Write a protein that binds this ligand. Structure first.
Ligand SMILES: *C(=O)CCCCCCCCC
Ligand SMILES: *C(=O)CCCCCCCCC
Ligand SMILES: [O-]
Ligand SMILES: [O-]
Lengths: 406, 406
């Protein structure tokens, strides 16, 4: 019965290191994909990625960063921005039982898990591994590494669900508030970018391989010649807060979360069934009386994936389908961080009245025919937006956000 | 609002491959710790572990097991058990939107993350890696690999929180039911046992190393000479169900979950603060009118950990201390699977009227003075039990289970 809003955001992504940079990129349809020497040298076929253009060296206190992996670093920087953007002072959120944190990653830290085994197998054994690998490699690193330094006393854990990870963290945060257990929950996620993890996707043929020479055109959701997704990394964090608590401190409210769906396909391990997506979106729209103005699709730019979701979208909206665009064409697929980052791109579109373009569509796929997929930045007043996140294991998450009435 | 009960359980641990075996071990105070040739050969100082004494070969269909890591295999086997024990048939939990799964692990699969890296750096490259490493290495593997073959259509994700992982999974399941979103939720988790992961703990001096010659005495919670925990693996899974729905099908009810606490220390990265534990136990007890008869402590057998919890317990119960015993003294520390396995040991004690002994205590720690620590199997009619789980990153979880009035 309690209402939930988002009052702060922070983000470190392939298209910007803060909301101002991300905003500019979204408006210009600027690609964040670059050529990766690291990937080429690893022997992978996919040589493109959506990397965070930022040197994180010295940006975090040494006694804190020694426990963190990149996913944690990205999520940490995103949280610092979110706190600042939310206008929360230490005495408000620190050592407060009503303030928690729910953030996770898709793979934890393959890089440090491998570093650990490599070091152990060297002549120095244990001495070479060091005492900080566990907090870097454990799956809950993103939450453990942020909750501790920020003095969080409320809920503290990570939710992981492949590409839906950070979307579920936000949804669960919403539930914590609706249950009256928390007033504020920092929700988000992070994902490192490395060949140790990337090669695994390359091995199953999930990554784009035909456009290494033109990195900016590799990610091309809904294009007839898409050939897999482009791996990316980074972090994002949003401040999920109970409505009255937010109004009481005169917070800036981006939007209210009015719908959250989380379903399971129970079918295929790697491909969506579409059936689960239909249920997920319908569940998220239950109770939402206003139409969806814009839908930030999951669209990873994969042959099967993009169309399964388009079919699900046709079945749910029929002849009233919303404007659609896949930001992954610009950013790439950040996996664990995708959910929160795309929620942020959607909040920015809602806050600034515009629809980011779905770029790189030279030839539209037959199955996308008739849908209103925006291909050029369009100014427009949005009121209700939806964002999809579907991960391996048939896990689905959908978030619906709406502007707060005047 | 709605009440929640546990109507089934499954388990695979160092002291038994099913509840019958576990009961026998618990009643006799038998250790599941053995010498590990694998750990010794890896170059570690700790050579003991709580291994699953079971050959999994052929226990799972080839088409399904090919996507799984050991954590998933253990959780999968535990779920089959739980389904049978709960008296559920396929059409009752399959393709059912009201039925979900929340299970996780603490480290995902260090073994396969390393396997992919090694394979990739080899003469075969991508071909040696194979197309199944992603689902084996991702942090959400335990939930993805179970929800797909069991045709789950409800919620589907993993919660990871170090040693508190499977405890938060159960608590989150309770919430999903209280929210009226699900009628049944399979909750639990698993953790693989391997040197790739173990060496990381040894590297930070967390594992027992002075008792390799006498494996069964290495894990000695509360003993003055404890020197770290003994790592273990395995899985566990419970059927969390809405009360009226369970009665309507004549299910066997082990107990009602009357309390669930989830807090954060916001203090130290590796050591509990004590304060967070206090708040967690008090939170789980709020509204529970009956006294706590038994407390299955976290007690990992570490110098600092064991006492912090003892201080917290004393802070919460003063002199009306409940009966206490650390089962890890017998089983070892199963990390991500500890939460659900220990909840299961407690349910068995509640079910069969006895208190499992806290073994290997030759010289009780002074700081344990004045507390009711049970060192010998005691038949006693139990009614309300509590189980603590505290993990790295200062994440806490407490579960309170009570017999249902006839
Ligand atoms: C989204 O479901 C695509 C697959 C993401 C898997 C999660 C990351 C795992 C990294 C080892
Ligand atoms: C409980 O918190 C003890 C430490 C558990 C760490 C998480 C499992 C290991 C991940 C690599
Ligand atoms: O997403
Ligand atoms: O535990």
């Amino acid at each position: 019965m309690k209402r939930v809003v988002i009052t702060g955001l922070g983000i470190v992504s392939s298209i910007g290191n803060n909301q101002q940079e991300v905003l500019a990129s979204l408006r210009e349809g600027r690609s964040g994909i670059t050529f990766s020497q690291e990937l080429k040298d690893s022997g992978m076929r996919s040589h493109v990625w959506g990397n965070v253009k930022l040197d994180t060296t010295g940006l975090i206190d040494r006694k804190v960063v020694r426990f963190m992996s990149d996913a944690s670093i990205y999520a940490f920087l995103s949280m610092e921005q979110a706190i600042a953007d939310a206008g929360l002072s230490p005495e408000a959120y620190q050592n407060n039982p009503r303030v928690g944190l729910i953030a996770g990653s898709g793979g934890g830290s393959p890089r440090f898990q491998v570093f650990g085994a490599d070091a152990m197998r060297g002549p120095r054994g244990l001495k070479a591994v060091g005492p900080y690998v566990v907090t870097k490699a454990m799956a809950s690193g993103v939450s453990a590494c942020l909750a501790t330094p920020f003095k969080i006393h409320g809920v503290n854990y990570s939710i992981s669900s492949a590409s839906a990870t950070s979307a579920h963290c936000i949804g669960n945060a919403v539930e914590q508030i609706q249950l009256g257990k928390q007033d504020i929950v920092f929700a988000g996620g992070g994902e490192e970018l490395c060949w140790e993890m990337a090669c695994e996707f390359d091995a199953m043929g999930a990554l784009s391989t035909k456009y290494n020479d033109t990195p900016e055109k590799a990610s091309r959701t809904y294009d007839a010649h898409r050939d897999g997704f482009v791996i990316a990394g980074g972090g994002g964090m949003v401040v999920v807060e109970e409505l009255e608590h937010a109004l009481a401190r005169g917070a800036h409210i981006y939007a209210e979360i009015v719908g959250y769906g989380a379903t399971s396909d129970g079918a295929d391990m790697v491909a969506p069934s579409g059936e689960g997506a239909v249920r997920c979106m319908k569940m998220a729209m239950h109770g939402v009386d206003t139409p969806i103005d814009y839908l930030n699709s999951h669209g990873t730019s994969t042959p099967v994936g993009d169309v399964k979701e388009l079919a699900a979208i046709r079945e749910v909206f029929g002849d009233k389908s919303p404007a659609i665009s896949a930001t992954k064409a610009m950013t790439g697929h950040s996996l664990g961080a995708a959910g929160v980052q795309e929620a942020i791109y959607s909040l920015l579109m809602l806050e600034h009245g515009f629809i980011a373009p779905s770029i790189n569509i030279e030839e539209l796929d037959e199955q996308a025919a008739g849908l209103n997929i925006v291909t050029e930045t369009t100014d427009r007043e949005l009121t209700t937006v939806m964002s999809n996140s579907f991960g391996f294991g048939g896990t689905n998450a959908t978030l619906v956000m709406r502007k707060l009435k005047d």
